[PDB]
Amino acid sequence: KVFGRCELAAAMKRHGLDNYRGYSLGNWVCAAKFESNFNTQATNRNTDGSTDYGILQINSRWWCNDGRTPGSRNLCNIPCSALLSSDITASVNCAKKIVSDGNGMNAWVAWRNRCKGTDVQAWIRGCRL
Ligand SMILES: [Cl-]
Ligand SMILES: [Cl-]
Ligand SMILES: [Cl-]
Ligand SMILES: [Cl-]
Ligand SMILES: [Cl-]
Ligand SMILES: [Cl-]
Ligand SMILES: [Cl-]
Numbered sequence: 415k416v417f418g419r420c421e422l423a424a425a426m427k428r429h430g431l432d433n434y435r436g437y438s439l440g441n442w443v444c445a446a447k448f449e450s451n452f453n454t455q456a457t458n459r460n461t462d463g464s465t466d467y468g469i470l471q472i473n474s475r476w477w478c479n480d481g482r483t484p485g486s487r488n489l490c491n492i493p494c495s496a497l498l499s500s501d502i503t504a505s506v507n508c509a510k511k512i513v514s515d516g517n518g519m520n521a522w523v524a525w526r527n528r529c530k531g532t533d534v535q536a537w538i539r540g541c542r543l
Pocket of ligand 1: 419447
């Protein structure tokens with residue numbers, strides 16, 4: 415599923431990401447834009463051979479099982495394929511574990527490089543939330 419910007423903002427808010435560990439909703443929308451272009455089916459191979467899955471490009475090195483990432487963990491206890499669903503529940507619940515891991519949203523290198531320190535509120539501008 416390719417979400418609309420305000421559609422994804424709405425879905426992330428319902429799932430409790432707005433100010434989760436102090437990250438305002440615009441931070442999550444901005445991260446999703448640059449990670450997936452709001453596409454739940456987005457997959458990208460990392461240089462270490464792991465893969466990033468779904469709207470928030472959650473990596474098989476630590477968070478999900480894809481059966482092909484040697485020496486990896488599955489800390490969200492989920493097949494990586496569950497992160498590609500039109501239903502963002504598994505992506506959001508896993509993201510809550512990631513952002514609680516100590517480094518906050520710096521876990522998402524695209525958030526650090528493209529959203530952090532920017533006017534992220536722009537990402538929810540015009541949205542009925
Ligand atoms: Cl957009
Ligand atoms: Cl915001
Ligand atoms: Cl997703
Ligand atoms: Cl594996
Ligand atoms: Cl392994
Ligand atoms: Cl959803
Ligand atoms: Cl980046």
